[PDB]
Design a binder for these strands. Structure first.
Ligand SMILES: [Mg+2]
Ligand SMILES: [Mg+2]
Ligand SMILES: [Zn+2]
Ligand SMILES: [Zn+2]
Ligand SMILES: [Zn+2]
Lengths: 266, 114, 196, 559, 141, 133, 168, 49, 43, 85, 159, 65
DNA sequence: CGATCCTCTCGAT
RNA sequence: CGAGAGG
């Protein structure tokens, strides 16, 4: 195109390795921040408990349920309940999951995020299905039942961002590095004898040219060219973590422009 | 127990406006916009972009206390240039930068495999 | 607290974004200060930390047992073979700006303890309430919506300042204050004042 | 004592304390719940009516609200219950028991209260979260820290009572103690550490940062100072932007060791019209020093101005540091391979010097120095050599510490750590003592059952050859443990001992005060001093000044 | 079998103890600089030998990683604090009816451990977690 | 306004006294045998070696507020390599008639020795140090 | 030489040679009489005591003795002209400033010095280190110090631990 | 994991604290301080086991 | 709990101090700060 | 009586810090209870700030009774006292 | 002992001297010895200085001794504070201890004395001696819940 | 006391990897280091999550209630 | 006859 | 009342 540039080194179902050229440091960082916190996802945020004759306490279980990853593909077509006109929740603003489990076997019975069942009318949107990546296809060990042990619960999953609770976090950790050779002197390597021998060289060093001692420091040089890697939890596919990241940022910049337009009258 | 609600970080309060544009007393053609329910995500980005404009004499943001989600933005420009127009342009450029990044990332992603 | 007489209470909580980060996306769970180190001379803290990093990476047990041949130098060797600088430092970036920090940070796991004594179990405030039977002074203890003791050491502080009107109300209005009828002849509270 | 000199009181609160880089010196962070508990009885006036009516409307649960409305005929109206808590029409003269609000003066305290400074008036800042928050530079007077200390708060109820607080106990009024005729509060920890780092000659900051720093100073005149470096890249120096925090007409001069007017070492201090000419800003300047920047700012610009200063200096330094970062690792205890040979070869000679005196003493060729036992002299010598040892080895370590050494950095700022610390962690722990003697023979003719009888060797009587970094041998371990215990015991002894001493001293002098004749007297009216302190001067307003007519040659005097 | 013996402080007075079976008595005739300086045998006439010098500590101090690298009082302080730390005091807490019980949601065994911890069931009933800790001057908070 | 002093100096010593970006240079005039100079310089932005012959200039030349270069239509009082701004803080009489001024460039110090500084270097908040080649 | 005294004369001077921007090149407009009598009259205004009687007036003259030594030393004709190059206008201000500062420097009647003094000894004592001492290097040079000595002193110990006589 | 070594007294679990004392039937000599007339003393607290 | 079950009360020449003889019998670290420092011991 | 005449008064013509503190408190207490103000509050609502203004403007009609240890006293008006501090 | 003393030329000079330190005291007899400067002889026992050279020398030594305890620590306290304690102790013509034996047995106020120590006993001898309480002390007003003649209340306000 | 869902530090879902971790150790007779690696727990914050986990739930389940 | 202040909790009669 | 405990 023309502005910031991309070079996707590695691409998987849960990881993007890329090079962000023609960008100011602020933008890369801001987009890193927004990926971490401001992207909407759907997570459990209400547990009605009918029976819990388990080892574990109601809220301990409830806590795990929020952390359980849920399909947030079509999340933009589900309202925040706070905006929904319904009294409480509904099919437009929420997804209802049910969990019934009883220790049938003598052997310890296990409870999985697969054992959760949607009851809500999904209205054809790719939403609320618990994220399974488990080879054996179970995904997340919620609880363990013994024998007479029963756990009957209902749960409403709502739209939210990691800023309100980390359970709505769509990404894991985000690798971020600029200037692998310290040509900018943006850091001061602590040493005993030799910085070069003592500090491990970066993977990204082969992506930039080495300094060359017979050259002075570059003063007009600026922070531009970033080696980022975005990891998904599985709520949203990797590309979307970065595309929705880019979007959500521009979305909230646009609101500022909009606010100036609004206060410009009365 | 004395902890505020987590939506207080992004949901606007009662009355509460997003931006408040106060005139700077200590300098001519300067202004202080208070952004309510915002952090270093917007703060840095806007300030950084303002510095790219050759008409912006001064630009800086600060978050007086971590507890509260709000930052102050001081902007001083040259004669015959409204800081509101400077902030407007700044935001506009930022969107166009992201607009490009969006299509660029997409273009690469579709050329990728796995 | 760490297992090294390094007790402290939380000051603030930052969310992942605002937190300092390693180029691999790692963020601290906790941030302790360089200052609470040289005075205390708790080297075992730093060793345990160095050791813990290697345990985590190697997928092994940290041998923090006393009289051993385990050395900072030997641990360092191991950690370096793992691809990190041997003395546990790491280049970190400012979560606000994204810029590298001029300093490298001693970063790694360390077994920390969640102790009793929690704010909300201690917070207490009283603006008038239950009074003792005998003395007619505020009751004792948080548990009973008690008053706080303005002891004699605090009495001394006020006298030092020369806050005489303030000292009086601390001892009369807040607390004890009462009215008696005295005889102008014998000067005793032996007056049967039939008010009304 | 329990019900009359001291007593349980109303309008009091307590909690865990926390520091706040973003709070004013004279401010105290009051948790929302506490502020909703404690009240002020405010008489209804036309100046306040509309505020008070709105507060009554907010009631007991919304923060700037109130509980209880008192009327003529002193009958209370409980706002959380009253069927008319909504209705309510305020009359002038009536009382509204409003919640404790922002800027109300309050008495903050930390026990043991053994100073006027352990109780000071503070401005209120109602805040989220359950801790009382306070400026780091008010830590020292209270002797507080954030490892779990709780602090007390008393709320004045009288108009004349809140005047007494703000006009006599206010934290700014309290900056310069009459105790030491110097400030009792200075720049500490991070801000002390950072100020050094920021202030170095090497430290240069660019436009981007400069502006955010400039904007961070509240007292800022909105004027960008001209960068020291104009040429390739306009660069500002740490000193330059920090001089923005410093007020005008602030003059400060020092001269440390090296110090020439060209200060090649960048030591001493020269501040003119409140701009730093040369010299690194560390403890000697920005601490609670006698001839410090604080002692000057208070005495020249005022307690209020000086109080705002702490704030700005912190605001800038804290910001710069947040973006620079500072840390401490195990590599900071690691001293050079060659230094390590030099250290062991040092302990080696100490070990021989002792063996030698041991061999000498044993041959009955030891001469006892008058007034002391032949054995006393031996022990005195051995001890000296071993102390000489630790010290040399430590100095060896200290020397080999690179300037980039984080420990060395705190030692330089004066923020944390002493030589002794560098010495023990890196070089050698040293001789252990109990009852002021080296480890004694607890067992018959031996310190431990792992030794032979009659063993006066460094090792036998408690000399720890090893550093904390190296580790301590079992024998060394136990001997250190014995010496450590002694400290712990006598700490517990002091706290109680000094506690009583203080009380008796107070009680003994309590009734003494200056009368309207500058005569210092007691409750009976007996003269202790005819002029207070022999000069009738207030201790806070005094400062060390050299008397020029006392020294130098009679020749130099006349000249 | 007479290989091990019980000795009290009074009898302890008449014996000579070796600290290690190895380093304390094999033979006589380079050195790792990193390792701590250990004094020469200079005693031969042993009657006994320690089981393990680390056994001089008891239950609380036995939880400390490297106490031989800490200043002696810090060791006393942590000996007091481990006692205030939360964890899983017993497996049957769900069944007991006691005033005040504090249980950690996700107890983790320490990454760095003492040999003694084994006999103390610390990695079986831990009281603490393995936080990722940064030593840094961050926000000043 | 206007230049206050100009001279070509030969570098005699270069000192990185426990500093990485700064160096203390010792100089003396090529024309004046009694003229001396001592200076702290940023060696990252302007590297200086032994026997270097630098051309030093002081001027009050080209209050208010610093506005960014904006070289769009800006022509500053230099064709020079290295430029600094400081304050005159001390004026010394080095016996007979020899004078010696002291300048601080935000901590980077200066000391010039001579005599002809007569109708020149005043106790001004002004002074821009200029160095070329 | 260095002793704690009210009024920093050094600062007042620096301030005057700033407030008045004096050029150390132009000769001062001061008289010997201006300096000599000026500095003499200033001494008469450094009131600590007020009463119109010799008994009190002597105590007054006594209370300021040391301060006036400093004043006279610092404001001697030679210095005021050669050292500080004070103009009549600048000098006059210095004199006013000293007088003003000196008066603010006086102790306030009502000042509860009893408690003050007690805490001022107490607090530092609480801070004191070691029950024994730091002296413990020499086998018998030891003298009771710190808290236990402070205890001996205050209790007026009839039988002290280390009685010593120092013979000149 | 419970170790025992304690008692249950009205549902409340009581620990007996091990009490340090000097052993009897022990002969000890003590130098008496300067003010006293007796220079030294041989002590024995004879008890029936 | 393990620590509590192994405590040592000492009532009332230098009983607070860590005596040589305590080697291998009493823990050199485990004792309360202040109050009953070194009077309360742990095996 | 006993007293001391206006002339022969030997105390500081200056107001003590405590003197100020009590005066300010006393007057702020009066203003707070709707007492008439002897100055024009330029948008001032706070009783203490008002008493502070009244002090600068020297519009407070309170006279200080300064007691001596023999019992005798000196009377000094707020008007006459110098307010340095 | 390294001693600073004026040079003929005026400058203060380090002219070292021989000094004798003692284990024990008998001031009375050691000063009357030849070869010793009796005008300079000192003792850490200020109570002996008192007995031999009077109460004013006592005051001086008692100060020197308090001062040293502060200074030994490395600390500094303004003269006036220790001067006042030293004065309080000394003003009775003797050495009034800061113990219930010294200052508390003093001719002060019954209520203010019992606030310290020997509470009941003080009050009984007060009743038996038929003592009059001035109500001028802090404690007395503190006890009576009255504004004490402390700073702010050390004067009276009128119209 | 169950494998936490998600790594406290980074947020990576670790709750699905427990059984699998125990199988790699027992069945595949692997060492912790390689086992953790095989489960793709690359950063030490994630390795500690599983490596340090004490699965008390099993002991609790042992009681009948 | 006194022997740091203050704080918290529990338990038992 | 006593025991434990916090700074
Ligand atoms: Mg400490
Ligand atoms: Mg503390
Ligand atoms: Zn809905
Ligand atoms: Zn009667
Ligand atoms: Zn992780």
């Amino acid at each position: 195109e023309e502005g910031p540039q991309v070079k996707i080194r590695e691409a998987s179902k849960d990881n993007v390795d890329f090079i962000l050229s023609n960008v100011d440091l602020a933008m890369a960082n801001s987009l890193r921040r927004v990926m971490i916190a401001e992207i909407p996802t759907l997570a459990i945020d209400s547990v009605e408990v009918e029976t819990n004759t388990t080892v574990l306490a109601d809220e301990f279980i409830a806590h795990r349920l929020g952390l359980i990853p849920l399909q947030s593909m079509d999340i933009e077509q589900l309202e925040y309940s706070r905006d929904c006109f319904c009294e409480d929740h509904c099919d437009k603003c929420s997804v209802v999951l049910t969990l019934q489990a009883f220790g049938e076997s003598e052997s310890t019975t296990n409870v999985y995020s697969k054992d959760l069942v949607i009851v809500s009318n999904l209205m054809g949107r790719n939403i609320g299905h618990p994220i399974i990546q488990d080879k054996e296809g179970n995904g997340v060990l919620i609880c363990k039942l013994r024998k007479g042990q029963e756990l009957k619960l209902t749960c409403v999953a709502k739209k939210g961002i990691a800023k309100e609770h980390a359970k709505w976090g769509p990404a894991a950790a985000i690798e971020f590095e600029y200037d692998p050779w310290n040509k900018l002197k943006h850091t001061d390597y602590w040493y005993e004898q030799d910085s070069a021998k003592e500090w491990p060289q970066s993977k990204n060093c082969e992506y930039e040219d080495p300094p060359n001692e017979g050259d002075p420091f570059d003063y007009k040089a600026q922070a531009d060219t970033f080696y980022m890697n975005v990891e998904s939890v599985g709520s949203i596919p990797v590309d979307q973590v970065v595309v929705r990241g880019i979007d959500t940022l521009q979305k909230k910049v646009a609101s500022i422009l909009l606010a100036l337009t609004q206060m410009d009258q009365d | 127990m004395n902890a505020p609600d987590r939506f207080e970080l992004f949901l606007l309060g009662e009355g509460e406006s997003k931006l408040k544009i106060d005139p700077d007393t200590k300098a001519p053609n300067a202004v202080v916009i208070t952004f309510e329910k915002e952090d270093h995500t917007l703060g840095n980005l806007i300030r950084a972009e303002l510095l790219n404009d050759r008409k912006v004499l001064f630009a800086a943001y600060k978050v007086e206390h971590p507890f509260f989600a709000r930052f102050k933005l001081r902007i001083q420009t040259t004669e015959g240039y409204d800081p509101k127009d400077a902030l407007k342009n700044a935001c506009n450029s930022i969107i166009n930068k992201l607009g490009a990044l969006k299509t660029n990332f997409e273009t690469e992603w579709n050329l990728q495999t796995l | 607290a760490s297992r090294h007489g390094q007790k402290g209470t939380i000051g603030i909580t930052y969310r992942r974004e605002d937190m300092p980060f390693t180029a691999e996306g790692i963020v601290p769970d906790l941030i302790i200060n360089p200052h609470a180190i040289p005075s205390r001379m708790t080297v075992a803290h730093l060793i345990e930390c160095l050791l813990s990093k290697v345990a985590a990476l190697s997928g092994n047990e940290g041998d923090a047992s006393p009289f051993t041949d385990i050395t900072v130098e030997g641990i360092s060797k191991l950690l370096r073979e793992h691809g990190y600088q041997s003395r546990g430092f790491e280049v970190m970036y400012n979560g606000h700006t994204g810029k590298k920090l001029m300093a490298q940070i001693f970063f790694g796991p360390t077994y920390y303890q969640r102790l009793r004594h929690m704010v909300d179990d201690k917070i207490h405030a009283r603006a008038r309430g239950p009074m003792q039977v005998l003395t007619r002074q505020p009751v004792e203890g948080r548990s009973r919506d008690g008053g706080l003791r303005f002891g004699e050491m605090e009495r001394d502080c006020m006298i030092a300042h020369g806050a005489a009107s303030f000292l009086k109300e601390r001892l009369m209005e807040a607390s004890d204050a009462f009215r008696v009828h005295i005889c102008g002849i014998c000067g005793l509270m032996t007056v049967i004042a039939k008010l009304n | 004592r329990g019900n009359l000199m001291g007593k349980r009181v109303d309008f009091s609160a307590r909690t865990v304390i926390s520091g706040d880089p973003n709070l004013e010196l004279d401010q105290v962070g009051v948790p929302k719940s506490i502020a909703k508990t404690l009240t002020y009885p405010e008489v209804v006036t036309p100046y306040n009516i509309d505020r008070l009516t709105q507060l009554v409307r907010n009631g007991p649960n919304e923060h700037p609200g109130a509980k209880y409305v008192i009327r003529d005929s002193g009958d209370r109206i409980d706002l959380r219950y009253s069927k008319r808590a909504g209705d309510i029409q305020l009359q002038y003269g009536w009382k509204v028991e409003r919640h404790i609000m922002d800027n109300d003066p309050v008495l903050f305290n930390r026990q043991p209260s053994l100073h006027k400074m352990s109780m000071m008036a503070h401005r209120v800042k109602v805040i989220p979260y359950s801790t009382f928050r306070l400026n780091l530079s008010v830590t020292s007077p209270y002797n507080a820290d954030f490892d779990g200390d709780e602090m007390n708060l008393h709320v004045p109820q009288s108009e004349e009572t809140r005047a007494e607080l703000s006009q006599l106990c206010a934290v700014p009024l309290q900056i310069v103690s009459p105790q030491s005729n110097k400030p009792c509060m200075g720049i500490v920890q991070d801000t002390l550490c950072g100020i050094r780092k920021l202030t170095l000659r090497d430290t240069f900051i660019e436009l981007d940062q400069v502006l955010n720093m400039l904007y961070w100073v509240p007292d800022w005149d909105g004027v960008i100072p001209t960068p020291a470096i104009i040429k390739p890249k306009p660069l500002w120096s740490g000193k330059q932007i920090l001089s923005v925090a410093i007020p005008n007409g602030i003059h400060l001069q020092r001269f440390d060791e090296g110090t020439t007017l060209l200060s090649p070492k960048d030591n001493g201090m020269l501040i003119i019209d409140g701009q730093i000419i040369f010299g690194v800003v560390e403890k000697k300047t920005v601490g609670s020093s006698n001839g410090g920047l604080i002692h000057v700012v208070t005495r020249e610009k005022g307690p209020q101005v000086c109080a705002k200063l702490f704030g700005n200096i912190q605001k800038v330094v804290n910001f710069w540091l947040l973006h620079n970062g500072f840390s401490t690792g195990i590599g900071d205890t690691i001293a050079d391979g060659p230094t390590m040979r030099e250290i062991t070869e040092t302990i080696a000679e100490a070990k021989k010097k002792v063996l030698d005196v041991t061999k000498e003493a044993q041959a009955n060729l030891l001469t006892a120095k008058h007034g002391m036992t032949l054995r006393e002299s031996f022990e005195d010598n051995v001890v000296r050599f071993l102390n000489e040892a630790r010290d040399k080895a430590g100095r060896l370590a200290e020397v080999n510490l690179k300037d980039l050494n984080n420990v060395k950095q705190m030692v330089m700022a004066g923020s944390k750590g002493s030589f002794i610390n560098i010495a023990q962690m890196s070089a050698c722990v040293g001789q252990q003592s109990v009852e002021g003697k080296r480890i004694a023979f607890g067992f018959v003719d031996r310190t431990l059952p792992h030794f032979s009888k009659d063993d006066y060797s460094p090792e036998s009587k408690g000399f720890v050859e090893n550093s904390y970094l190296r580790g301590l041998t079992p024998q060394e371990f136990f001997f250190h443990a014995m010496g450590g215990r002694e400290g712990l015991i006598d700490t517990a002894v002091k706290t109680a001992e000094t506690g009583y001493i203080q009380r008796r001293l107070v009680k003994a002098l309590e009734d003494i005060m200056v009368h309207y004749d500058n005569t210092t007297r007691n409750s009976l009216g007996n003269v202790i001093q005819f002029i207070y302190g022999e000069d009738g001067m207030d201790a806070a307003h005094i400062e060390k000044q050299s008397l020029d007519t006392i020294g130098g040659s009679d020749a130099a005097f006349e000249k | 079998e007479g290989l091990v013996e019980y000795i009290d402080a009074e009898e302890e007075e008449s014996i000579l103890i070796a600290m290690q079976p190895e380093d304390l008595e094999p033979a006589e005739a380079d050195v790792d600089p990193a390792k701590r300086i250990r004094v020469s045998h200079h005693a031969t006439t042993f009657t006994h030998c320690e089981i393990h010098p680390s056994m001089i500590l008891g239950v609380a101090a036995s939880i400390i990683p490297f106490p031989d690298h800490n200043q002696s009082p810090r060791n006393t302080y942590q000996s007091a604090m481990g006692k205030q730390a939360m964890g899983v005091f017993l497996t049957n807490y769900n069944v007991r009816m006691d005033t005040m019980a504090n249980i950690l949601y996700y107890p983790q065994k320490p990454l760095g451990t003492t040999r003694a911890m084994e006999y103390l069931k610390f990695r079986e009933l831990p009281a603490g977690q393995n936080a990722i800790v940064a030593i840094a001057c961050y926000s000043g908070y | 306004s206007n230049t206050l002093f100009d001279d070509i100096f030969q570098v005699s010593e270069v000192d990185p006294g426990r500093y990485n970006k700064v160096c203390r240079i010792e100089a003396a005039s090529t024309t004046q045998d009694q003229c001396k100079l001592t200076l702290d310089i940023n060696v990252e932005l302007f590297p200086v070696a032994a026997q270097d012959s630098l051309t030093v200039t002081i001027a009050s030349s080209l209050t208010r507020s610093w506005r960014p270069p904006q070289a769009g239509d800006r022509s500053l009082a230099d064709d020079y390599d290295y430029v600094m701004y400081g304050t005159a803080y001390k004026f010394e009489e080095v016996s007979k008639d020899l004078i010696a001024v002291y300048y601080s460039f935000g901590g980077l110090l200066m000391r010039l020795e001579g005599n002809y500084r007569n109708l020149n270097n005043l106790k001004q908040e002004n002074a821009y140090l200029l160095i070329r080649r | 030489a260095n002793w704690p005294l009210p009024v920093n004369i050094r600062r007042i001077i620096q301030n005057a040679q700033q407030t008045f921007h004096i050029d150390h090149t132009k000769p001062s407009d001061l008289t010997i009489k201006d300096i000599v009598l000026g500095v003499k009259d200033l001494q008469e205004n450094l009131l600590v005591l007020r009463g119109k009687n010799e008994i009190i007036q002597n105590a007054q003259r006594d209370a300021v003795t040391l301060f006036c030594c400093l004043l006279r030393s610092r404001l001697a004709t030679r210095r005021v002209l050669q050292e500080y190059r004070l103009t009549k206008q600048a000098f006059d201000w210095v004199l006013s400033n000293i007088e003003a500062q000196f008066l603010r420097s006086v102790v306030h009647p009502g000042e509860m010095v009893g408690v003050l003094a007690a805490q001022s000894i107490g607090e530092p004592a609480t801070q004191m280190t070691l029950n024994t001492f730091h002296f413990a290097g020499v086998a018998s040079k030891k003298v009771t110090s710190g808290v236990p000595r402070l205890k001996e002193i205050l209790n007026v110990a009839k039988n002290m631990k280390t009685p010593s006589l120092t013979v000149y | 994991f419970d170790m025992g070594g304690y008692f249950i007294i009205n549902g409340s679990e009581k620990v007996l604290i091990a009490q340090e004392r000097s052993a009897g039937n022990i002969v000890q000599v003590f130098k008496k301080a300067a003010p006293s007339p007796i220079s030294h003393v041989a002590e024995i607290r004879s008890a029936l086991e | 709990t393990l620590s509590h079950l192994r405590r040592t009360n000492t009532p009332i020449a230098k009983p607070r101090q860590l005596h040589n003889t305590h080697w291998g019998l009493v823990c050199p670290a485990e004792t309360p700060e202040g109050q009953a420092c070194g009077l309360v011991k742990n095996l | 009586e006993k007293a001391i005449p206006k002339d022969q008064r030997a105390t500081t013509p200056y107001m003590t810090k405590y003197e100020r503190a009590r005066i300010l408190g006393t007057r702020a207490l009066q203003i707070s209870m709707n007492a008439p103000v002897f100055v024009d509050l330029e948008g001032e609502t706070d009783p203490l700030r008002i008493a502070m203004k009244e002090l600068a403007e020297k519009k407070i009609p309170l006279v200080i009774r300064r007691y001596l240890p023999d019992g005798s006293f000196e009377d000094w008006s707020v008007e006459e006292l110098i307010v340095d501090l | 002992y390294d001693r600073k003393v004026p040079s003929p030329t005026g400058e203060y000079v380090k002219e070292p001297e021989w000094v004798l330190e003692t284990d024990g005291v008998n001031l009375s007899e050691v000063m009357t010895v030849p070869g010793i400067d009796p005008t300079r002889i000192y003792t850490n026992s200020f109570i002996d200085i008192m007995e031999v050279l009077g109460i004013e020398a006592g005051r001086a030594a008692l100060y020197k001794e308090v001062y040293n305890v502060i200074a030994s620590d490395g600390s500094y306290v303004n003269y006036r504070h220790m001067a006042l304690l030293v004065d309080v102790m000394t003003t009775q013509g003797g050495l009034t201890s800061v113990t219930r034996h010294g200052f508390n047995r003093s001719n002060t106020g019954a209520l203010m004395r019992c606030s310290f120590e020997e509470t009941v006993e003080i009050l009984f001898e007060a009743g038996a001696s038929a003592e009059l309480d001035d109500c001028r002390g802090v404690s007395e007003n503190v006890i009576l819940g009255q504004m004490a003649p402390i700073g702010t209340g050390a004067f009276d306000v009128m119209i | 006391m169950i494998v936490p869902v998600r790594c406290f530090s980074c947020g990576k879902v670790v709750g699905d990897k427990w059984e699998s971790y125990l199988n790699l150790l027992q069945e595949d007779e692997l060492d912790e280091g390689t086992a953790l690696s095989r489960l793709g727990l690359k950063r030490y914050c994630c390795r500690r999550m599983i490596l340090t986990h004490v699965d008390l739930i099993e002991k609790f389940l042992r009681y009948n209630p």
